Amino acid sequence: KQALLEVSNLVREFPAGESTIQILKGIDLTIYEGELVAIVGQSGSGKSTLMNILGCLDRPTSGSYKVNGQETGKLEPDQLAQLRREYFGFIFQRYHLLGDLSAEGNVEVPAVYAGVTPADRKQRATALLTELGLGTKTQNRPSQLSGGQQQRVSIARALMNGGDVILADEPTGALDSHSGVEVMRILRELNAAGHTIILVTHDMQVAKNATRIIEISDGEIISDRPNVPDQSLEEVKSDPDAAPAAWRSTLDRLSEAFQMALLSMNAHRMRTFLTMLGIIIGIASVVTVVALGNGSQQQILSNISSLGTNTITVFQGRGFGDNSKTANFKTLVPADADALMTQPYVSAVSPMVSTSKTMRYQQNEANATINGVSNDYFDVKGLVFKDGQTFDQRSVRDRSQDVVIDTNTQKQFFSDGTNPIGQVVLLGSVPARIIGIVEPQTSGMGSDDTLNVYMPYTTVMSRMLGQAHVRNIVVRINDKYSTSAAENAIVNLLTQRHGAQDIFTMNSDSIRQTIEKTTSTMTLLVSAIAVISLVVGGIGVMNIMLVSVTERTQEIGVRMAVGARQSDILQQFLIEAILVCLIGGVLGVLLSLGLGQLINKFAGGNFAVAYSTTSIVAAFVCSTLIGVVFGFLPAKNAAKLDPVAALSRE
Amino acid sequence: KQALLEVSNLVREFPAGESTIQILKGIDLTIYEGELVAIVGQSGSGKSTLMNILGCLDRPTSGSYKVNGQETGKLEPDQLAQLRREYFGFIFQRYHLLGDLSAEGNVEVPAVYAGVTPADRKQRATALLTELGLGTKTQNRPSQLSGGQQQRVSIARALMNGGDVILADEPTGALDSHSGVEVMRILRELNAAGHTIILVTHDMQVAKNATRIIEISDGEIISDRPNVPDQSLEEVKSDPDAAPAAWRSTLDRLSEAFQMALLSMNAHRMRTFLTMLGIIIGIASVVTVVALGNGSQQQILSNISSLGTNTITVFQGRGFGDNSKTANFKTLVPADADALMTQPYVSAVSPMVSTSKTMRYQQNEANATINGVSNDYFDVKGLVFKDGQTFDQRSVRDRSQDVVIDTNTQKQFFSDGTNPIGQVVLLGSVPARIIGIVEPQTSGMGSDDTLNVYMPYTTVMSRMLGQAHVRNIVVRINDKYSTSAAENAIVNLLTQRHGAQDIFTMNSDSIRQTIEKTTSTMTLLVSAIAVISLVVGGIGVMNIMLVSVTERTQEIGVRMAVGARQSDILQQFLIEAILVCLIGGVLGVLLSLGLGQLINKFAGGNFAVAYSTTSIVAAFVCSTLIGVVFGFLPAKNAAKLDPVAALSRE
Ligand SMILES: Nc1ncnc2c1ncn2[C@@H]1O[C@H](COP(=O)(O)OP(=O)(O)S)[C@@H](O)[C@H]1O
Ligand SMILES: Nc1ncnc2c1ncn2[C@@H]1O[C@H](COP(=O)(O)OP(=O)(O)S)[C@@H](O)[C@H]1O
């Protein structure tokens, strides 16, 4: 049969000066289930090292330590953690509780790592705290408890996963006489109930509370004797404490890891706020710059949209003056448009003049732009008729006073729902009857807001301007033919048709393309400058997480001792970083949205802010990725701590 | 006569639940110089509270406490610190040493806070450490010392500033039996030497080391009896330890505050690196963006300086399509420049043609752009002659083969130091004699880097091109007399000479002004976005400083008890932040300079990086201001800590 704790020729060496020093020197030691063992020696004796090895927090480097038959010498971290969850509970001189949790929570932690039903572990935690006289202090934080009360909490914690072997490191060293007596009473009562208890001390008067006293000095055991305490006659057991013992639970520990990181945020609200603030400012500047560049691009493009697709505009305008010295040189005339119409690369053509008059209806007045155009103009610019129809070529010839109106003029003058078609409006001093309504090119509520009116160019030229010439001529190029080659043909045709190079062009597609390219490139560079800010925010996240790993070093050690896997610690800290970056990426998005409405109020007619939902999604994802990347390094550093050095980190 | 410590009616209340609780209930107590006093009681007794008041770390809050006649009831923090420096030394259960310093440094700290000569305090530190058996461990850090060794370090520390009244709070509570014997031996020997010692404990067997035992319970003193230790027979005194003891010095404490901040940076090197890194990225991005916008503006403007000042260039339309359409439609001819010459607003005028030929010298060849210009061209464009002169008007008439060169061609062909003037070079197939060298308009190279040659336009048109027309004509407007009106007048005149409006103009000053304003505006917007990054860096600095205040809370408390003023603490932390941000600004500047040299390797001849020295200085100042500001709140929070709560922070 196996003895519960079986040590054989245990040698623990440490390197010291291109050589070694033995701290444990060939220790043989058998401890049976139910013994009350005290191991006593002074500083330097090796009692600590021995207990660390006994608690599966360290490995021999020479010898054998079998826990219920299981050799620990060659076990890997999660296997030793398995043994700690299975057979050991720990009590520390300084009563290492987790300041952020309640007594109940600290008691639960080992059951969290062992994968114990949360309802059942709640029951067990409050039951053990009540059994040890802390039934009314269940919800107190460690900062709300006295030393003895905290040590009683950690006794209940040690009992959570069974309490098979309670390893107690000088429990009565920090706290006073009375509460030391109480702690020792509890331990002896647990031993009476069958709990194996190993007490490590330097005060023989503490060791005398045990039934077996092993004395250690300079790495070797020098005494091993039974003992009967004197105070067993006073402390009669009038309060009979007898309380001995691929995809499933990973989810439970992930839920708890989220909860734990969340509580660490609630504990340090200023720190959390500042770190999130850095991420909020970063994400907000990136989403803002991107939406500003996109919306401004769309706005500038709509301001071009008064031109068509495959549209070549033929301008010639310049300085003003007399009829004989300026008008005689205005060679662009509608006969030129008639000539262009017959070219194999021209699918549509329209002269274009314009004037601005006061438009009247029953009582309304409003200034409006009256465009003198061809019946084909709507075909050139791609305008869509809402209700009516265009001009007849005859009505252009006959100087008709028919008129086409856009959506904006309908809103201005026919807000009642009165059908504009057939209604006579008055343009300055010229009456005109509406024969059609056009849906504009504009994309946006307040991106255009102008009143466009369309009459035959012959009528506007004759009745309103008194001129024989055209402001410009728009041409839509056939067959998707090379608009540039058609452009050159137009320049040669009109130039040969005129007496000289009296014209210049505007290629709508070329200008649009240049605007898209230039605005896109500038958007990319500037939003990269914003991403620099976001990078600095991420660096801040990493630095804070690393520092909180240092802060929580002892918490990490305690969690390991109670049963945490390196995985579990990694998940805990990494989830903290991720949650911090997400909560703040969302707030950066919302801040950017509010700032977007601010700009959309106070901006001009070129600056506009438009938020693509995939830039919002990209913001959320890149915030989470900053959490995963920048937070990872600290979370791994926490997961890889030596629980011995962590427990004694001070 | 006055007793050293004179206590009367100490009542210490703390609020607890819409009421208060008395922790000291009217304590009277007289302690004379040289007494060895133990104050003993269990948790709740008030012994610590009493000892804190005795040490000038708290105020009676009701009653009187006189230290050598000085009432503490109404004293302000720095006055209580004065009393601590004057009369008190402190020893703590956990032997609160400063992990970053050596034993010697920890011993020095109280002398730093007092007005003590650094050399003399070094001597005292090593002397006291040698007296207490730490002569060979003088340089060890606290992590390199045992509990007893650290406790002897803090004994020497308490003795540094005199050791008048040594308050020891459970000194033998953390450490083992043997080293407790040694600590108590040392304390008794100091008492024999005359030191007043007040020992506070809960273990009567420790209290029995004193000669006077005052027992306290539930806030009141219940026993006060003399005592003779049992070990007075053991200690025959064979080793007689008898060692009893704003413009001027503010600068010395500033030196020490700088040194302490520096050592704290060395202690946490990764933290320092990351915190500094944020500022480095911020300052580098801002200085980089500013230098990029400024230099690019200078480059793009240099490409315009070739258009001269107040110069209106008369360009002409394509005019091509055929060789016969070139002959037909190239209406801009040098006679038009002759006509422009006579106008009242034209001070100088030049036709301009250009072609590219291979420029040859003795054996050297390089392709060069030959500009056919008027003798006035240099006045219009504002070019300055380095050595020679321009053409004669006669030589323009006579189709002269004179040539003027720029500095780039001088470098290409006359690198020897050979004077180009009088030398005959060959341009394609036309020889030409150099009559002058011209210094260009440009500052940065960018795209030019071009070989410019100037010959009479009549000669280039006649001999090299075989054409009757001019590419464009430049005019310099006198007095700046309505250059915009001159543009229109030129168009009207040239249009009147031709058969149409077949010419257009370009106002050099308008273009320059537009470029200057637009690029300047882009510089401000983008560099503001970089400053966003710098802001996030500062926020990170603040968060880190708050965290290091929390981390060092006990260090702050120990410093206060040892004798630090709130001033001293604030200076310490403020200097830390300032120093980190200052260095991060310097490194941000150096990174920015390197990045500028990197950018200058890019293929964009429009992007250029120019560093103003006032943006470097601005970087230094704004980095230091981030240090002071963010930067400040943590340092004040450190200075305003309650030294009692700070010392008991865990
Ligand atoms: N890294 C390391 N390096 C060198 N020596 C070590 C190390 N770790 C432990 N030891 C030794 O084990 C003992 C630890 O606890 P003990 O209870 O025996 O005395 P303490 O004062 O440390 S509580 C101590 O006496 C040390 O001499
Ligand atoms: N903020 C505060 N609030 C309420 N009560 C306080 C407070 N501070 C001290 N006290 C009391 O004074 C005593 C402190 O030291 P003592 O040596 O007498 O016992 P300890 O267990 O704290 S070492 C302690 O027993 C407490 O009951």
Author numbering:
A (entry chain A), B (entry chain B): 3 to 247, 260 to 664
Give verbatim excerpts from the published study on this entry.
MacB was purified and its crystal structure was solved at 3.4-Å resolution. MacB was crystallized in the presence of adenosine-5′-(β-thio)-diphosphate (ADPβS). The two NBDs are dimerized in a head-to-tail arrangement, and both subunits contribute conserved Walker A, Walker B and ABC signature motifs and residues to form two composite nucleotide-binding sites at the dimer interface. Electron density was observed in the difference Fourier map at the expected position for the nucleotide-binding site. Although the shape of the difference Fourier map is not optimally fitted by the ADPβS model, the phosphor and sulphur atoms of the bound ADPβS are clearly identified in the anomalous difference Fourier map (7σ, 0.013 electron Å−3). The binding of the adenine moiety of the nucleotide involves a π-stacking interaction with a conserved aromatic residue (Phe16) in the A-loop of the NBD. When MacB is compared with outward-facing structures of MsbA and Sav1866, which participate in alternating access mechanisms for these transporters, the overall structure provides a similar V-shape opening with access to the periplasm. However, the locations of these openings are different. The cavity in Sav1866 is present in the outer leaflet of the phospholipid bilayer, whereas the cavity in MacB is present in the periplasmic space. The TMD of MacB does not exhibit a distinct cavity in the membrane-embedded sections of the TMs, suggesting that a substrate-binding pocket might not exist in this part of MacB.
